C-alpha cells in the first residue's frame, strides 16, 4: 500500500536529518516529504526521474498510485479543527518558461493542486509570493519561510513543503498540573523545564531493541480518534536514540501498537514547541537523488524541454505544538501522585511520532533533546 511506501521513504529521509542533528530537537514530516517528491516525479525525466523513483520505491504514474495518494491526503486532514493542522506542498517554476503541452492539466488532475509560476528575476517579488502562499496554507503559522536574500535572480525552480500541527489530545493534560521539573540532557547536564501530568489508562508496551535495551513506548490518542502520538524513550538514561531511529518503519510502529495494553499510569510529559527547517538537498543527495540539483545534469523535460532547469532549493519547514485551551470540564481529572502508585516520567530525550492509525501513515516524527 502507498501509505507504508510513502511513510518509509519519509522515515529514511528523517534518518538522514537526525544523524546530522544528533543532539538537537528535530521535528519532521515523513508523509510531507514523500508527497512533494511524488509531485516532483511528474516534472522529471531520464536519470533524474529514475533516481527519485528508486529512492521512493514507486512511480506516481503507475496504476493506482496517484488516486491512493489523493485518498491518503483527503483522509489525513479530516478529523481536525481548523486551528489544529495545516499543510502545503508546492512547486514554483519561473513564469516565462514555456511548459510542455498538457503538463499543467495532467499535474492538476493527479494531485488536485497546481504548479505555481513565479518571476524569479524579480527577487523580492518572488520571495513575497512564495512566503504568502506558505503562510496562507499553514494557518498563518509558517509565515516567513524565505528570508531576505534567500531567493536568487537565476533561480528557476523551488520545492517547498510546510506543515503546522497543534492537535488536542483525547484527554488534555490538566492546566493545574503544570509544574517545573528537571530534564536530563544527552550531554549529562540538566535543565528545569515546564511539564504537565496526567493519570490515565495508557496504551503501553515495553519494547526490547536488537541491542538489548528497553524502551517505554506509550500512545496518546488525539481527540479525533484517528491520529495518535507515540512516545518512545529508553528505560536507561545514557542510551542514544540513534540505534532505534535507524531501524524505524511504519510496520515497526504498528508492531508496537499491536503489543500495547492499557495500563494505569501517571504520565509526566514536558511541554514542547518544536520548529525545524530542513534544507532537503543533502539528505536527498545522500539517498541518491543528485541529478535534480545539478544545473546541467538535471532532467526536468516533462515540465519544460526547451530551457535548462534544476532545483535551486528544496525545503521542509514544520512547526508542532504539544501541551499548549480546552474547557475546564474537558481536560483531565487532576490526580495527585499520592493516588497514583505507578508512573512514567519523560525527563530524558525521547522520540515521538504522530501516526494515522487506520493506515499507519507516519505524519510527523522527531526527537525532543531539550524541551
Amino acid at each position, epitope marked *: 500500500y502507498v501509505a507504508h511506501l510513502a511513510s518509509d521513504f519519509g522515515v529514511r529521509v528523517f534518518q538522514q536529518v537526525a544523524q546530522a542533528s544528533k543532539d538537537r530537537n528535530v521535528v519532521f514530516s515523513p508523509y510531507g516529504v514523500a508527497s512533494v517528491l511524488a509531485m516532483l516525479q511528474l516534472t522529471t525525466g531520464g536519470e533524474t526521474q529514475q533516481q527519485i523513483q528508486a529512492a521512493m520505491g514507486f512511480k506516481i504514474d503507475d496504476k493506482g498510485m496517484a488516486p491512493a495518494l489523493r485518498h491518503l491526503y483527503k483522509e489525513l486532514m479530516g478529523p481536525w479543527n481548523k486551528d489544529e493542522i495545516s499543510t502545503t506542498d508546492a512547486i514554483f517554476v519561473q513564469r516565462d518558461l514555456k511548459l510542455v503541452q498538457g503538463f499543467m492539466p495532467h499535474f492538476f488532475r493527479l494531485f488536485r493542486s497546481t504548479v505555481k509560476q513565479v518571476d524569479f528575476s524579480e527577487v523580492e517579488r518572488a520571495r513575497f509570493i512564495i512566503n504568502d502562499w506558505v503562510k496562507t496554507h499553514t494557518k498563518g503559522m509558517i509565515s516567513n519561510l524565505l528570508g531576505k536574500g534567500a531567493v536568487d535572480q537565476l533561480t528557476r525552480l523551488v520545492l517547498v513543503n510546510a506543515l503546522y500541527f497543534n492537535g488536542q489530545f483525547k*484527554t488534555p493534560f*490538566p*492546566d*493545574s498540573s503544570t509544574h517545573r521539573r528537571l530534564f536530563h540532557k544527552s550531554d549529562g547536564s540538566t535543565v528545569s523545564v515546564p511539564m504537565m501530568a*496526567q*493519570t*490515565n*489508562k*495508557f496504551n503501553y508496551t515495553e519494547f526490547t531493541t536488537p541491542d538489548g535495551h528497553y524502551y517505554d513506548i506509550l500512545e496518546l490518542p488525539y481527540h479525533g480518534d484517528t491520529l495518535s502520538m507515540f512516545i518512545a524513550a529508553p528505560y536507561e538514561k545514557e542510551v542514544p536514540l540513534s540505534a532505534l531511529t535507524n531501524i524505524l518503519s511504519a510496520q515497526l510502529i504498528s508492531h508496537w501498537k499491536g503489543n500495547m495494553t*492499557r495500563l*494505569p*499510569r501517571l504520565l509526566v510529559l514536558p511541554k514542547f514547541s518544536l520548529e525545524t527547517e530542513v534544507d532537503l538537498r543533502k539528505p536527498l543527495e545522500n539517498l541518491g537523488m543528485t541529478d535534480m540539483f545539478r544545473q546541467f545534469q538535471a532532467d526536468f523535460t516533462s515540465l519544460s524541454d526547451q530551457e535548462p532547469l534544476h532545483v535551486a532549493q528544496a525545503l521542509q519547514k514544520v512547526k508542532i505544538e504539544v501541551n499548549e485551551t480546552v474547557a*475546564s*470540564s474537558s*481536560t*483531565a*481529572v*487532576i*490526580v*495527585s501522585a*499520592r*493516588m*497514583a*502508585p505507578e508512573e512514567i516520567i519523560m525527563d530524558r530525550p525521547f522520540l515521538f511520532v504522530v501516526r494515522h492509525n487506520p493506515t499507519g501513515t507516519v505524519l510527523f516524527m522527531g526527537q525532543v533533546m531539550e524541551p
Partner: nanobody, 123 residues
Framework: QVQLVESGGGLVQPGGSLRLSCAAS????????IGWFRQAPGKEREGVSCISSSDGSTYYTDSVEGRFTISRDNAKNTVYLQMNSLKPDDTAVYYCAADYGSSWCTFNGMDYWGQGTQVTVSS
C-alpha cells in the same frame, strides 16, 4: 448498561459529616475499582478517593487524608464515601467512577462515571 448513581449529598455546616453512596442498579461493584472525584465551580475536576478491586488498598488525595473514608457495603452492592470535618472548600459536585478489575483509579479512562451529586458546606 452499567449506570453509576450517587446519593447522600446535601448541605451541611462546617465541621459536619456526609456519607455519599455509589451504586449501579443490577451490578455488583466488588470487582471494580471505585473512586470519587469532584468539581468545584469553575475549577478542573480532581480525584478524591479510590478503593481497589483486588486488595484492600485505598487511596486519598492530600487535602482529604484523615477526614474521608471510602468503604464497601457488599450486601447493598454499594461503595460509601464518609466525609468528616467538612470545610467550605469541599463544596463541589461529587462523582462516582468505576473501572473493572483495576488496582487503583486513574479517573481519566475509567469504564464508567456517574452523573454527580451536590455537596455544599456553608454556614
Amino acid at each position: 448498561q452499567v449506570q453509576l448513581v450517587e446519593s447522600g449529598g446535601g448541605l451541611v455546616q462546617p465541621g459536619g459529616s456526609l456519607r455519599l453512596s455509589c451504586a449501579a442498579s443490577g451490578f455488583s461493584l466488588d470487582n471494580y475499582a471505585i473512586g470519587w472525584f469532584r468539581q468545584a465551580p469553575g475549577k478542573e475536576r480532581e480525584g478524591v478517593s479510590c478503593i481497589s478491586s483486588s486488595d484492600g488498598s485505598t487511596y486519598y488525595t492530600d487535602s482529604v487524608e484523615g477526614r474521608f473514608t471510602i468503604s464497601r457495603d457488599n450486601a447493598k452492592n454499594t461503595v460509601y464515601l464518609q466525609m468528616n470535618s467538612l470545610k467550605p472548600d469541599d463544596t463541589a459536585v461529587y462523582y462516582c467512577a468505576a473501572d473493572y478489575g483495576s488496582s487503583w483509579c486513574t479517573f481519566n479512562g475509567m469504564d464508567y462515571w456517574g452523573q454527580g451529586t451536590q455537596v455544599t458546606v456553608s454556614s
